[PDB]
């Protein structure tokens, strides 16, 4: 067993809070931001060997990252911004850091009870998106 094994699943999304201010602040468009707050996707984690691989699947975009922890990539991001990620464990924590035009935004991955919290960070502005098992 690995240690993101208490991540890997099939997750849907049952509420999300202050994301509109979130995307906002880290400089979405209007019309981007109208039809991205309104989508309600599905996680999908998965684990083999030493890569991750997170997918995200909504009426809006389908996006997929694959990665191993503490090395960077390169990741297209829905609101298609070109952006360097690190994504570390922290504590058993999911911690995904994306730089891009000297700006940052970091978004963290927890569980906690039954559900899967993802806590995403620009500046000041923290939204709080919540998954339960699908
Ligand atoms: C518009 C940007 C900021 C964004 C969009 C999405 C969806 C709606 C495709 C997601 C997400 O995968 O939940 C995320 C997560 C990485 C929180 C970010």
């Given at each position: 067993?690995?240690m993101?094994?208490?991540?890997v699943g099939?997750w849907?999304?049952?509420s999300?809070?202050?994301?509109?201010?979130?995307?906002?602040?880290?400089?979405?468009?209007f019309?981007t931001?109208?039809?991205?707050g309104?989508?309600?996707?599905?996680?999908?984690?998965?684990?083999?060997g030493?890569?991750?691989?997170?997918?995200?699947?909504?009426?809006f975009?389908?996006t997929?990252?694959?990665?191993?922890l503490?090395?960077?990539?390169?990741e297209?991001?829905?609101?298609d911004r070109?952006?360097?990620?690190?994504?570390?464990?922290?504590?058993?924590?999911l911690?995904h850091?994306?730089?891009?035009?000297?700006?940052?935004?970091?978004i963290?991955?927890?569980?906690?009870?039954?559900?899967?919290?993802?806590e995403?960070?620009?500046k000041?502005?923290?939204?709080?998106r919540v998954?339960?098992?699908?």
């Amino acid at each position: 067993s690995h240690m993101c094994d208490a991540f890997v699943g099939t997750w849907k999304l049952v509420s999300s809070e202050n994301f509109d201010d979130y995307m906002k602040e880290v400089g979405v468009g209007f019309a981007t931001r109208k039809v991205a707050g309104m989508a309600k996707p599905n996680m999908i984690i998965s684990v083999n060997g030493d890569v991750i691989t997170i997918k995200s699947e909504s009426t809006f975009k389908n996006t997929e990252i694959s990665f191993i922890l503490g090395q960077e990539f390169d990741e297209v991001t829905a609101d298609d911004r070109k952006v360097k990620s690190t994504i570390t464990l922290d504590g058993g924590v999911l911690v995904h850091v994306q730089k891009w035009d000297g700006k940052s935004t970091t978004i963290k991955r927890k569980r906690e009870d039954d559900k899967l919290v993802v806590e995403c960070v620009m500046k000041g502005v923290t939204s709080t998106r919540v998954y339960e098992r699908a």
